[PDB]
Amino acid sequence: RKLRRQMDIIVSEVSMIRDIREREIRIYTDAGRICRPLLIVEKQKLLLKKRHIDQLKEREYNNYSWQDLVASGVVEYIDTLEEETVMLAMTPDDLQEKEVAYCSTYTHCEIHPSMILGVCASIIPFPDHNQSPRNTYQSAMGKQAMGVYITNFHVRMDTLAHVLYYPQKPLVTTRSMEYLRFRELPAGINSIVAIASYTGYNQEDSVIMNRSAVDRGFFRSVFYRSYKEQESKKG
Amino acid sequence: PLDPGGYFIINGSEKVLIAQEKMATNTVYVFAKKDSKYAYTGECRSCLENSSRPTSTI
Amino acid sequence: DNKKKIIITEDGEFKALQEWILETDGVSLMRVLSEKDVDPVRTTSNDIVE
Amino acid sequence: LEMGHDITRLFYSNIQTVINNWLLIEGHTIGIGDSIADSKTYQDIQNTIKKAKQDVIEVIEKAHNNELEPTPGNTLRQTFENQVNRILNDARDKTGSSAQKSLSEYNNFKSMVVSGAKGSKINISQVIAVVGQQNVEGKRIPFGFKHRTLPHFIKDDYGPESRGFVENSYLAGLTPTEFFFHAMGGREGLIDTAVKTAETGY
Amino acid sequence: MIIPVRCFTCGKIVGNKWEAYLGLLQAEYTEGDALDALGLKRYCCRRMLLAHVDLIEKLLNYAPL
Amino acid sequence: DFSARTVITPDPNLSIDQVGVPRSIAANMTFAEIVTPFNIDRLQEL
Amino acid sequence: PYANQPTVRITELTDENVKFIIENTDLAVANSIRRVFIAEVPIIAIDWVQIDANSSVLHDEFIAHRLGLIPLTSDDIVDKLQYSRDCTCEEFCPECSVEFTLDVRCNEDQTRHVTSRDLISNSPRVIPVTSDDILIVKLRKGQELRLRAYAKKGFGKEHAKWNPTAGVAFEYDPDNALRHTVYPKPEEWPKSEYSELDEDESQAPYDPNGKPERFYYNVESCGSLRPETIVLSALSGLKKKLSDLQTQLSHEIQSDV
Amino acid sequence: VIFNMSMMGHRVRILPWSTFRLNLSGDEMNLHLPQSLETRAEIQELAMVPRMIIVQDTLTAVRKFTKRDVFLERGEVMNLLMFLSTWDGKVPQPAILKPRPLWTGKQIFSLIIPGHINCIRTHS
Amino acid sequence: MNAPPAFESFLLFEGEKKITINKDTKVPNACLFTINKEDHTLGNIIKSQLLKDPQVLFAGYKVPHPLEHKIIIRVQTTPDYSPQEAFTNAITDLISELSLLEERFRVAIKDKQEG
Amino acid sequence: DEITPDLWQEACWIVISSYFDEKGLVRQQLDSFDEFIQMSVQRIV
Amino acid sequence: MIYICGECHTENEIKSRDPIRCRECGYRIMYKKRTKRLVVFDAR
Amino acid sequence: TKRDCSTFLRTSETGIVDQVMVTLNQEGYKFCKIRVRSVRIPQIGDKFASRHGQKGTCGIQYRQEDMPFTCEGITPDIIINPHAIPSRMTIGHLIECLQGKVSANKGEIGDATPFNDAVNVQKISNLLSDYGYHLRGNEVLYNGFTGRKITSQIFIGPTYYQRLKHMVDD
Amino acid sequence: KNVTLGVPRLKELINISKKPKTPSLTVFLLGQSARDAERAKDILCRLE
Amino acid sequence: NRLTFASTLSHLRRLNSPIGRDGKLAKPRQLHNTLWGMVCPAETPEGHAVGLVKNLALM
């Protein structure tokens, strides 16, 4: 474990699994192993100190990056097999102290539980407040949403490309949204939505819009279809 | 600049290699199947490093 | 009520008495029916093939 | 039956047209205020949840010390799963029933269920009182890892949170452990729904 | 791509306010304080400025024909 | 005469039996009708 | 068997908006007048756009459309001008339209954005409101945007750009005297500015007999038509439409007889 | 026209916009037109929607509409009765004549009920 | 393509009568005014005024369909009175009603401007 | 010293920011191809 | 017709059945400047 | 004699060609690409979907006058059916509306962390009440057609929405 | 007792398949033993 | 999928369940506990191929 934290001949990518009940120690170095970073906890105390965060806060122009954290041994990587015999803590508040000690030996602590979400699920506020099928449904809808896919759309030629007139970053945004860069390139426009049954023109699957708003560019978007053809001397 | 890349352009079409999950190699697994003539299965597919020969399972 | 036996009372009003029922896995209606202290009328299985 | 089909259609059209015009005067809406219940009911819901959680621990303790006696028609492991399920199931119904009484006449949630048009009393229960147990394949969350549902929970843990019992309503917000357990339960429904349509259509 | 001319809800002009909005942000003013200076009392118009993205900046990086 | 498929939207004003159709779709669709003296002029103008 | 006298008073008058209270008026008349401001009021806005050269990053359709949303200071010119349909023209004329032009070219390394000030109009009075400034597009070095545009009178219902009202705050019975709206918990709801009530009183007592009166109006203008003149045109515009109905109505009675 | 083996016939009404309009009481559909007069007559006689047989947006309002609390003023009653196709043309007498007229929701709905049908039901 | 022209809401169709008066045989002294190319802005203007008239027994308006852009007004009066007179007389009151409002507004607008 | 709970919310997101800045969102795609084109291709030959 | 090189952005006249290449660059992708027939745009 | 084999527009949509590209393919033969640009205006047939829940088609479009305006004169851009919220929608829509109203009013982008204890429904409600708004976000909406106040107080908020590729015009 | 219902049973009813999933059988007792609990145990044993 | 930037990111991190005997015997569609922090649980295409196609977790 010390060698893994010190970036010695054993690389942090390598994972060691200790099957205590079977007296088996398994070390895997082959590719294809899915793993995620986890804060290391020693004697019910995080190895990540204030100084580490202070350097990270000035991560730019200081020659400091994420790789340094693994070098110092504060954070390592745990795979599925090693996660089998590795204890986790949701947040430091859970492990710092409790009236009744649920577990007095914490080995690793999750940086933040929200990272379990994917690219499409991460953009959903309050997914816990949301039903599971709805979160799954959004994942499909989010991909089908039209918006600025990239910046160099004019130069390229695509068979299908929908670009929104006014792709506006949302009023309610998740912290993980920054890493996805969805803020820079959003795929929707906010709307002052009043939930009411007006004139009975909206059923469970329906909605009523504002004609004046659309005339001002409420949801208008462009459509691009590329036609290709070549004159070849086949015969 | 914001485009992360990570795909192949073939004949002008951008293609992404979808990861295909496969059973781990050089690992011993014991499974119980009620349809087989035998009670237990000692399945263990063994292969060398990256790949010197086609995977062999016993 | 459906499982419980319904027998016409002396007064006339319908009454459903409490009778023990033994729901058993598998189909052995041919042999189960031909058993002592087993109702040959109301004993029915859920397997149409049997 | 009394008049026929042609007259009945006009009955449908008149109801839809007249009510729609009146709806512009009365109006139907929905908001956070409907989900926000009085503090009195929140304490009762938490108290019932707390009582259920303590009762589950007591049942677990009885099985831990071998005090629990299995029913003649079931085994110890299955009997324990049955007793714990009823305690959690009863709490959801009891807390959910109190939520239904909590809603006032002006409340929009009550109006929908009272008329029976859309939604159900269970939906309000999951929004206000408690989501409830997230059963997978007809049982609680299985031990995907070695005797533990998730790495955070201790080994061989049969508690409410560990086995997927969701004690937090949608409005309050689910814990990180509960969110994954909720996803597992929802995933089963989607898979069943996907195959249900294919089989039923056949 | 670019800030809309006017609010889609009511119709108040918001494009001209974008230039002043950015200038106020670099002037140590708070995100909400700048909106008040521009005169956006309604929350519909404040939406058009508080959470707007100016994509044309990155498009202008590419050279033209 | 199968028509082009299009999305469905509600319309409380229309009767349940009635159905709304756009001009473009109805233009493509045709209905053969036998002309009669009582409606000879109607077909003549159309 | 006749109408009442709509007494009206003004609370505060400013460039952006004007606040006035109308008393002794029916609810239908007050509510109808509110929507008369949005739709019936005619203003001059760019409708016809033609581009001679467009090298900007934005597309031809987007740039041409954006001009329409820009309001024009048509205070009295709109009244004298006439719709293209009723004019004797097949092509736009000064009497049934106005000329607009925008010829700009960016050659400096620094980014240059063309705004409404560069939008030249033949009519000196018919000019953009800002003429900070309504920016149209941002132009890169070597990018030019030369185009010609025209503006014509149009109803607000025809298009949103022809709507001079930047949000109309129409209120009546702020204290809820007639219980037209019932609050489950009136205490929580905040007090409206126009309401005259004490802190400890949630709402005024219900009167068995009463009608909506003392309508509060706050017409906010986008700068095209002054908020003190929109009301004058709206009231005249609403009634002139009403009279037109009577003229056609008389013909129908003449046919029946 | 006929569309979705049991199919329900419909009477086509031309509308300006593109999307189809259906008085449900979403998914794409294709409507089929019977060319022959014989089948057209048959379809309108047995395959029509009335012979085949409410939205959730109306049932919820119906419960509120019939509540005893609901009282309708003369002005409000006029609008509701205008949309009533099966109206005899005579305004029903108000339930509360004084101090001011006030029609109850049931009184307006009474005219909605066609003919004379008697039934007893219970609220949820 | 299928989008209707924006001006059809108020523009009068060629060869189409703006106003059509149709008598109703269901109840005596009843008429229907099927106005075309108008919206609720005009329907509520006359309905409220008609109610104010004591000689009006039943007055109201409705729109068969918003896209149709035509409004239907039904007016019933006493045998001595006529629905046609009610519609004509009500309009005159509105013109007088708005004239006082327009005139009074011009009186008060200058008062605020000067102080 | 130590990260106080009142500051952990901001601190936890800072380390995540560094992880994406260095690794990125497609690091798994690029890394495997880099290994394939650097060693696996040589190994096959 | 007159085309534009995608690298130097300079006018280069290319005739029918002629190789597509920029004299100043050799770049093999060419664009079309614009059409002299203007269209009508309506702000809607 | 030659036979025409040109390529026409795939659909009947009206569009303006954006740019034209002429190249040589790998085989060396002349090869060209052209991008046809068309503008689609949202209409009654377009399908709009919120960030969560089922997509909803635009049942009808209403002018600003016909839309239900509030006391301050804010006609909602979009009106959704309340009957969706119970089952095929989530309370997050109401919470997001409440957060959006506070975010816009206070001029600060709200935090959408799934498991952040700092953000709560009660906390958001308290913040909204400081800006002269109902703590639950409900507002009195005046019906556009008839000016009388609606008996029920509508819940209105700036909810994020996205336009789905599914469009009637296509 | 777990009795398969819904689509799985509906398929098996139309699908005459000889071997269903949970082909349960309901046994009804008669006489004095039908009321007593202990007297019904011997029948349970002799059937199981 | 270049319709949206988020879709492009999801496609690159997309995962596929095993096919053949391995996938057939197991239940790839069902959500397992091991996905916590490794594969997004909510994200999955809707239809018959529900749960077979997934997306890699952010971290």
Ligand SMILES: [Zn+2]
């Ligand atoms: Zn606004």
Ligand SMILES: [Zn+2]
């Ligand atoms: Zn002219």
Ligand SMILES: [Zn+2]
């Ligand atoms: Zn060149």
